[PDB]
Paper text:
Members of the rodent protoparvovirus I species, including [name], H-1 parvovirus (H-1PV), and minute virus of mice (MVM), are utilized as replication-competent vectors to target cancer. The T = 1 icosahedral parvovirus capsids consist of 60 VPs, with the protoparvoviruses assembled from VP1 and VP2 in a 1:10 ratio. VP2 forms virus-like-particles (VLPs) for members of the protoparvoviruses that are otherwise antigenically and structurally equivalent to VP1/2/3 genome packaging capsids. [name] kills transformed cell types that are either completely resistant, or less easily infected and lysed by H-1PV and MVM.
To enable comparative analysis for identifying the VP2 determinant of selective tumor tropism by the protoparvoviruses, the structure of [name] VP2 VLPs was determined by cryo-electron microscopy and 3D image reconstruction (cryo-reconstruction) to 3.17 Å resolution. At this resolution, the VP2 amino acid side-chain conformations were unambiguously assigned into the cryo-reconstructed density map, from N-terminal residue 37 to the last C-terminal residue 587 (VP2 numbering). The [name] VP2 monomer structure contains the core secondary structure elements reported for other Parvoviridae structures, with nine β-strands (βA-βI) and an α-helix (α-A). The conserved jellyroll motif contains eight antiparallel β-strands that form two β-sheets (β-BIDG and β-CHEF). The [name] capsid is ~280 Å in diameter from 3-fold to 3-fold, similar to previous reports for H-1PV and MVM. In [name], this depression is 4–7 Å deeper, and 15–22 Å wider than H-1PV and MVM, respectively, resulting from multiple subtle side-chain differences within residues in VR5, VR6, and VR8. At the 3-fold axis, the single “windmill” shaped protrusion is the same height in all three viruses, but is narrower in [name] compared to H-1PV and MVM, and has the same curvature for [name] and H-1PV. At the 5-fold region, the depression appears wider in [name], due to a difference in the HI loop (VR7) residues that line the floor of the depression, and differential positioning of the apex of the DE loop (VR1) results in a 5-fold channel that is more open at the apex for [name].
Author numbering:
A (entry chain H), B (entry chain Z): 37 to 587
C (entry chain Y): 540 to 587
D (entry chain Y): 295 to 343
E (entry chain Y): 393 to 490
F (entry chain W): 442 to 490
G (entry chain W): 344 to 392
H (entry chain Y): 50 to 98
The structure:
């Protein structure tokens, strides 16, 4: 049944575990939120452009160019995709510690207890008071995109996904998508004589796509007694591994054989002289086998062009860089460490006066990192003790430029390269992503662990059907309408598959553990606890605590 | 089920295609709108007349006479008939390009989510604020005319049909129909001494028809939980052809045989001398066969009296002229090119300051056009090189009048005449029409491609049942009542039949294609895209891109 | 699914110099014929 | 931030210092349309001739 | 008769002159020494620039499969018998698997 | 430049290297990483699972 | 080329390919084995490997 | 001539027939030959590689 005065759904946020057999777990995560929806600020679609004359007009500022072209819509999307939505911090600890790999299974979603209210103002004498009252006949439009016709638009990009706190209400992300303006921009250094083109092109007859929610899809009209239920969507994806790899290229294979065991705990072991050592190496003209030059099964990780900007018709952009360990060289960019900026709803702390809170995610998987300053290329024919001209060192200048070194432009990717798939991030991390429709596809998307093979889960779009006053002129440029807002509950169920880790190691494994307050380490428990006034903060948890044997 | 707080319908505007077999397509077009209905400005029927003393009082202004007699009704009609309602511009492109002929099949309609609200004013001190609130007990009257008892009154005539934009709300057209006043008016030229009768007659006992919605039809009363559904109406109509004909009367049949192929690409071919040529001609006393005078199977298109005004009892009116190609003579009227005037809702642009936007539709089907200035009649017995007195040329004066020429009054229509049926127009075009009840019927209606053979689809009439105050005097001349307005959704489904075009031609066919902005051609894509502020414009698309072989 | 009209391959009148001028797909007086590359993939697509 | 007033006017965005997003650049607090993280590289530079 | 086929798929193109590499640690408004610009000389050679020898292909790279050409285009091709095979042949849209 | 230059791309095809009768390795185990090399260098055969 | 992760500097592998008439072994990644009498060598050889 | 057929929703079977008259000449040599082209003129001068 249903109707006004009868609630159409229930609130379940709790997470469940079930053991299907040996090592297997079915993780069923419920999540529910109250969502606050405002009447759209314009009833009609708009094609708008941002263009920076101030930033890009001055020389050398290219990196900050924001210029693009977008289609603004009245619709808003409820985006359930982040890790921080589905799990509470302890459930993330329990999973990160105990399980080798995890995989997505199904997703369900529902909307219920729709409530639309209207606002009037009185009496305007002294100070106005705003009176709130229901419209029982009003409705809310709801459209799900099953076929992914519309441009796929993850909200986590801007951190607009549903809030991470069950008890706080949350808001939708207004739906919008790109349009093709064909920007032109020119390259300069800090102080340079000349001009900068900095122009944007006219609309393209070939490339112009304009989509409309109403034309594209079926819209459900939900009044207070109505409820909407998405069917069960089943993921097809590859599981991801929850245990990090420590094992470098130089740790692969059989170690050399030591001559004899050391006498005392301080003493170092010794090896057969490199001249007489037996092994396999690709160096020519020298009779040696040494731990550095011996042949390894594959390359682990690879050098990458870093802080390079490639420019197609759209404009300059930094190409992605696969997340890899930061070596002791501390250099973040060459290894592609992610850096998030996020608000109080998703993170930060309610005590913080700053507008946003920022965190750099330094990758685990210590095997694939690259120290940039210590990488070097050596001349052929090979020689021990190269003179300066026989070795390519990072300290030298490239093209006569001081701060540009070969490791900037150098690219090692090849058939022999192996790297681990990067890791999920509990708050602020993206759970899944849609695969690009191109024929030749990337081996991984950079931000998202899971990539739906065929068809991604559909986007869920909502808006308030307009409430019109007595006077409505369809030809009028301006539209007067009744101030209106609404609220509704969103409930969803995400099922997962995971497998317990075996532990064969003698020694204790590393684990995620809370720590007493008063010591400054990252895990101090005060940060997961409320304050006196209720200010709460939610910070990224390390993932993949447990080591793994690569080879 | 149903009730307050439970929505009675769904919103589907999308268009579907299905392939029934070889070449056949079933096009199912859904369309949906939000409709804004105001309480009628008078509760009772009225018989009113407009009579121009100012326009027609002065001499020679006859063409602008507006005088008529009409029955004004409180009811309003929801009129779904235009092409611009059902299809989006791309769906019109896809159909116009790929299909030879299309035909109507069925029509469905529904009304749901009725919402009635009332308006009060307070406190009138400082500035008044208008408070809006529901009447859950109020109802809306809905009457469909299945039997076409009432005068058939297409709203597109005045461009009052439902708006062409799915996301913008739209308004009904107030229902009204003609009544017979028997006007009298006299003919004068620009400055002339005399008087003009310019009178209108008394009501006629023979000809007076006064219809009332309540007496005529069954009315459904719809409250907020109620919904109304029209049955399925099935068209009986003849399909229309979507491919234009280029083939003139002089392109019919077998060409003459050339003597020999030309030597070079510049050289013209030569034909057997006209004295010796073999053929068939109706000219007498001359031994010739020439491409102009040879006999053709039929006349393609025909000369027409153009800008003639015939006057029955009602008054002077211009008789219609079948749409035909405009020849290189550019003359629009002789070939009957349609000219539309329409508003922002149906067209125009929201940026335009003008009240209306006007477009002249120049007919495709290049075969049937008539250059007026170059048509001529020649004396009998026929002669080559006629002296001035043997030929009737358009340049000569008729009846001693300078600008009146024989091509004005000349009428070629005969048994041998063949012409193509004119073409649909995506915005502003009328889909169907009802056939006149006269015994001897026209071969085509001029504006509408489809004409329902027996019984046209019914007219859908709606009004708000009156809300009365506490004081109601049935004998009072004036009626006070509660200010009331309402909104509801209209949804309809139009199924079509169409057939894919075969292409036997070597060369590429002409097609409707978008074009880059910045060039001024009619198809520049900017015109189908929103502006920054949301201003959108919708302009007529060419139809029948593909050529066809007449004979 | 797009509102606006899609781009299409279309012949064009002779006398304008654009690549699609129809004269190029038609024979000459002496029969000389020319066949030139046609654009492919006229219709835009949504990558992501 | 808001819809533009007239068809000529350009829209404006949240200041790059305060913008929320994801980028791989280090040591700078910004999010700008050029440096933000994208799912994959589309096309690639190539040794040519 | 000669014709240059300019690829459609406007997404994957590269303007060469405007591609640049920037030094680490990153900085806004790089001075000349912090940025690698196409205009500079490589190995002291005038017309040789880094974009000539630079190769971006990596795991993150996605590109569309090129397009057929109505006259003069090759319909199919045979796949090389090598063990490790190219992801696409350049001229031919279709490549027979076996 | 041939020292640091890397031509590997989508168009690249190469034969799988060859076994060596004495001193050659018959098989090898595949690394447990998610994204795996197309071949191990020394060993002709690589056990899938 | 020698790339260095946390473990230390190491030469990255190079797929075996033909040595061209340029005789250059390293660029084409030609394998070089060192082995003892048990697996090879000769029992007459005085050398260790 | 070329034919089209619609197998269902959205699917088309395109069947293209083509036919030609072919003109074959007696081969200019009855036996196999192993021939080489070598440019002394083009490649002899510098830079023409």
């Amino acid at each position: 049944g249903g109707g006004v005065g009868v609630s159409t759904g229930s609130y379940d946020n709790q997470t469940h575990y079930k053991f299907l057999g040996d090592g297997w777990v079915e993780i069923t995560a419920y999540s529910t939120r109250m969502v606050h929806l405002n009447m759209p600020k314009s009833e009609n679609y708009c094609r708008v452009r941002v263009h920076n004359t101030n930033d890009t007009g001055t020389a050398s500022h290219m990196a900050m160019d924001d210029a693009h072209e977008q289609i603004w819509t009245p619709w808003s999307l409820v985006d359930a995709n982040a890790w921080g939505v589905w799990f509470q911090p302890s459930d993330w600890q329990y999973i990160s510690n105990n399980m080798i790999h995890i995989n997505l299974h199904s997703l369900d979603q529902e909307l219920f207890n729709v409530v639309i209210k209207t606002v009037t103002e009185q009496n305007t004498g002294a100070e106005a008071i705003k009176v709130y009252n229901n419209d029982l006949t009003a409705a809310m439009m709801v459209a799900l995109d099953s076929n992914n016709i519309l441009p796929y638009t993850p909200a986590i990009d801007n951190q607009e996904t549903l809030g991470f706190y069950p008890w706080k209400p949350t808001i939708p992300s207004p739906y919008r998508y790109y349009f093709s303006c064909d920007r032109n921009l020119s390259v300069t250094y800090k102080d340079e004589a000349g001009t900068i083109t900095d122009t944007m092109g006219l609309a393209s007859g070939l490339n112009s796509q304009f989509f409309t929610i109403e034309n594209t899809q079926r819209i459900n009209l939900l009044r207070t007694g109505d409820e909407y239920a998405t069917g069960t969507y089943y993921f097809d994806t590859e599981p991801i591994r929850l245990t990090h790899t420590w094992q470098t290229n130089r740790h692969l294979g059989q170690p050399p054989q030591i001559t004899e065991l050391p006498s005392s705990d301080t003493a170092n072991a010794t090896l057969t002289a490199r001249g007489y050592r037996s092994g396999l190496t690709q160096i020519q003209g020298r009779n040696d086998v040494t731990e550095a030059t011996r042949v390894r099964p594959a390359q682990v990780g690879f050098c990458q062009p870093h802080d390079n900007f490639e420019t197609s018709r759209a404009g300059p952009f930094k190409v992605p860089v696969v997340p890899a360990d930061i070596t002791q060289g501390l250099d973040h960019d060459a290894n592609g460490s992610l850096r998030y900026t996020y608000d109080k709803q998703h993170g930060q702390s309610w005590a913080s006066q700053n507008n946003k809170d920022r965190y750099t995610w330094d990758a685990v998987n210590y095997d694939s990192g690259r120290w940039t300053n210590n990488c070097f290329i050596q001349s052929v024919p090979f020689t021990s003790e190269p003179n300066a001209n026989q070795i390519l060192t990072n300290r030298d200048n490239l093209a006569g430029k001081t701060d540009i070194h070969f490791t900037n432009a150098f690219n090692s990717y090849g058939p022999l390269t192996a790297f681990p798939h990067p890791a999920p991030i509990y708050p602020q991390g993206q759970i899944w992503d849609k695969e690009l429709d191109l024929e030749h596809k990337p081996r991984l998307h950079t931000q998202a662990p899971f990539v739906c093979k065929n068809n991604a889960p559909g986007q869920l779009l909502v808006r308030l059907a307009p409430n019109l006053t007595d006077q409505y002129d369809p030809n009028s440029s301006n539209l007067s309408r009744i101030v209106t807002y609404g609220t509704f509950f969103w409930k969803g169920k995400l099922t997962l598959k995971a497998k317990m880790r075996p532990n064969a190691t003698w020694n204790p494994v590393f684990q995620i553990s809370a720590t007493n307050q008063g010591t400054n380490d990252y895990m101090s428990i005060e940060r997961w606890l409320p304050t006196a006034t209720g200010n709460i903060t939610n910070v990224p948890l390390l993932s993949r605590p447990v080591a793994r044997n690569t080879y």
